[model samples]
Target: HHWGFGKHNGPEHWHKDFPIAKGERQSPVDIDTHTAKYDPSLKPLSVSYDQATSLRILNNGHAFNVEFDDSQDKAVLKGGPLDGTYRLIQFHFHWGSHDGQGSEHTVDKKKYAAELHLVHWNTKYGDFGKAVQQPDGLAVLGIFLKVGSAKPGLQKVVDVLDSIKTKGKSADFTNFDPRGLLPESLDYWTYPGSLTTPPLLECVTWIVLKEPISVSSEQVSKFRKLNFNGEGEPEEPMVDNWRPAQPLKNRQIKASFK
Candidate 1:
């Protein structure tokens, strides 16, 4: 059932090497309102962006991640009877072997071309790492990226993808706004979940956006071509680096809107 990214470097190999990789609760799952029970009472926090804020970009070659320093910005949360202020920490992406599909969360067993994760922590928790250990410590905003006609706002990111295409290479990205990459609708689906990767920490609150954005096949192809192995020395190339789905373990997934 494995789609060949290449010999010895496919999703099958990943699951074999890492048993927990097949956990059902794993991300890149599709979001469907019909399957989700929503509570109208829940509301998402208001996010503010400052133009003066500088974005630090790194070309780890594996993927591009952006870090935003929003200690001074005010993030207001309303509704849900559970409200508080949160600060921006960092945002990263997870991809598969090719650009056509790599994200963990799927819809009706359908996989998106790619997925983006914007990680934020409760300011009250003090630190990002520390908060990730608590039940309500972290909130990850997930967005699905699909191949389409329109250019993905991710152009700001892909512009520098080559600089970090060889691993351990990073550069400063200037004049970039994280919000620009998000879809027009703020409407989202939230649930209690864990980190999709190892340590399999069960301390995350997920907010998956209902809408998806478009990116060119070319850009996705570039992402698929990325090599995970460190620079130099010839060896087996790494593709489809995504982990397998995880188990539900009687855990319930709740959405915000019905």
Candidate 2:
């Protein structure tokens, strides 16, 4: 597909097709830590996840996304730049060719080893597809990752990588609580931005955490085996599946902590 991360088909070319890619509120911005405004009114985040809601994992050409059962609002993201409850729908990751590169969002001109996005849709908007079209429809929680200790919680998802090494492949992944994937601190940066992927919907209220969770190089490499190619196509490794930072424009990034 032309909508991918590689020469001739990367973020630089997305704006040509998906015009919103260059929109003012584009995501994965270079978050200037010192310049971010601390919002005293931004409430502490409340995330309650039900392990049983985790359904499966899939290699969706871009990232390995873990799907969740949003049949009920039992598992949801509440508070923090939100007016109503946002039910968890899925979570995914973006990474680089090696440990030195990869995160879509940078901090103080520095990039991390990888980045994770937990996507949720506002229940007030009904479903994900429809929610993605409105201004206050979705909430994306971004978490950065550096190469360090092997995160046991991440190991659970990494253990099943072999089953979803190609596009269109999916595997049963139950009893997984997405909460275990978060860092110790809930401190975050909030703003309005579009999705980092194609169609680049500007419907997200981004809640990017300040503290990053840890992951080992081994765990990070396990996911690189994934290919954008399907069953019989060329084996193109799914590395560097991240978009570059966009301009902040007239947006104000609000931090949850001082």
Candidate 3:
């Protein structure tokens, strides 16, 4: 009963095992900008990333994850639709097979080449496992990636992909501040939603930035080289690992700026 982005175990089949997959607050929703209400009360997001907290990067079959040392609040996300500080736990990317359709969340029904999810957990909930169960437990900073010029910040991760080309492989990736990967403008749309993946818990408060970061086509192709299959199995590249946008289900989408 493995869940993946493939035809057999893809998002469409997730509801079989995880009934919440079709829940009301599912994530990666289509952001219809024109109708999104602007909320001046939503304070500007505050982010401070500590390079030392970044430990390593790994290919986890579904996507590559850059895990952080969340023992302390070294790297944290605050403000912007949040009640308290949330520690950065890990960050991951979701991309398409090609340059045309990769991003999980869409803008005005338009998709991007990729999307980055900077996962943070509220410490008040006790632990990461416990946080995922609370209604205000997690806040994921979503930054869209469009194909364009090469981005040095992203290239650092891409350069290390050769070492962890297969699933279950990992490499030490330290002294990296992901803050450099964000777009110039922090304007975003905030909403209540669930995790886009399996066991899609409706505990996340999504803060999706309106501006997208640039990425080169060559770099995106490198991401496709990472193996989704095991070492002994036939080569199966990891691509199109994004879940399509879910229904808004009458939820209100609030924008940080007018």
Candidate 4:
């Protein structure tokens, strides 16, 4: 009944509850390569995610989230468009019911099979709750996933999907290094955007990787097996959880490379 990617409560209906859905900086914009200005001044992102900090993977009824222990700066992200160190909080995926379209951010109007979001919060704000309201509160590193050969890094996550099939289910998913999931090149486009999902806060500095990691069709199928409904409810498969690209408005997208 709450905000979800369903027919009744999906993104189009979010404006009823959260007026900011129509705000100036809403995210998941189309990355028009032709218009993106290459900025040499943008620093290459520096990411260090400690494998031991990986805590658990939970099905939050929307998307499955892999959480990290952020009590310390063990897994942190610096450089790029960030002012200070941002502590890694969690990561999740936005996928489609079919392979043709799934990714939130597109390049030249091209959509991939899915997209991965590595979420972090600015350390200067002290806590994530307080920081989410600030202009520079959150940073999300997005990686696109194309259907091709199986990715070993992604296989680990897929293997555990059956255990957490329903909403609110979770299991211990630790000792996993997220750095392995990144593409060979960290080349990306930087922009000021908002959370793609509901509440649609005008925070988040987006760092979207240009290179996409590969995932097999079989692997993508496993993601669709997840249920949006809980144990007692009828099975409602979790798929097409992505929000369509918002208008680019007056924002400028800066590419880290030429």
Cα lDDT tens digits for candidate 1, 174-256: 66777777787767777677676544455677777778777778766766555554578453234555544545555555666
Candidate with maximal lDDT: 4
Error of 3 at 151 (Å): 1.2
lDDT of 4 by residue, 115-168 (tens): 999999999999889889998999999999999998988888999999999999
Error of 3 at 121 (Å): 0.2
Candidate 2 lDDT tens digits, 72-162: 6678888988998998899999988899889989999899999999999999988999999999989999999999998888988988988
List TM-score per model, in order.
Answer: 0.81, 0.97, 0.98, 0.98
Off by over 4 Å in 3: none
Each model's Cα RMSD: 4.4, 1.1, 1.0, 1.0
TM-score of 1: 0.81
Pairs of residues clashing in candidate 3: none
Q: Count residue pairs with overlapping backbones in model 3.
A: 0
- When sorted by TM-score, best at the front, the candidate numbers are 4, 3, 2, 1
- lDDT score, residue 223, model 2? 74
